[PDB]
Write a structure and sequence with these properties.
It is classed as oxidoreductase. With about 120 residues, the chain is α+β, with helices and mostly antiparallel strands. The protein has a single domain, classed as Beta Barrel (OB fold (Dihydrolipoamide Acetyltransferase, E2P)), CATH 2.40.50.100. It contains 3 helices and 9 strands; from the N terminus they run E-E-E-H-E-E-E-E-E-H-E-H. The termini are far apart.
Length: about 120
Amino acid sequence: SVRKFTEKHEWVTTENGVGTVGISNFAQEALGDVVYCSLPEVGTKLNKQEEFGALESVKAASELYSPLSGEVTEINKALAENPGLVNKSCYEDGWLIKMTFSNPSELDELMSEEAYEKYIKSIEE
């Protein structure tokens, strides 16, 4: 019952068969100020690894890939008017989507926060 990460610098938290997905601090730094969030429709089916949207900044687009197989249940409506929540609160108020997840074994494939710490330390050295 802890946050896990992807090698593309996304995160997911889980409770009750529902995952909440966002981007890590490393990811939001790499983008700079987010100007637009392209998010999926509620009810969209996703496979793990499937594209679900994109973030835009002056610097780049960043394509979003699902960390889990399942079905979108919520998108963060605050990001239409306040996309910069992704930078100011990437783990909390700047969450992107929530989804039910159909294959719990998939979490075992993701990175623990300890592994993600080691990952970004090695990248940044």
